[PDB]
Amino acid sequence: GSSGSSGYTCFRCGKPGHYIKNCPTNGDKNFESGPRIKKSTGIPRSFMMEVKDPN
Ligand SMILES: [Zn+2]
Numbered sequence: 001g002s003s004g005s006s007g008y009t010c011f012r013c014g015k016p017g018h019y020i021k022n023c024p025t026n027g028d029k030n031f032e033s034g035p036r037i038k039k040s041t042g043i044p045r046s047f048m049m050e051v052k053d054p055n
Contacts, residue, residue, distance in 0.1 A: 012020040025031040
């Protein structure tokens with residue numbers, strides 16, 4: 001879980017607006033997973049990298 005961009009997000013399905021306790025998927029057998037089917041393209045860190053070098 002990340003802390004900053006957004007206060008918090010449903011740790012159940014991974015969708016904002018509601019909490020794991022108020023998550024809809026709860027009352028469902030077949031639901032989607034995470035944000036999308038795609039997890040990553042092929043990079044370690046694109047933005048997560050905040051490292052800076054003056055030289
Ligand atoms: Zn949810």
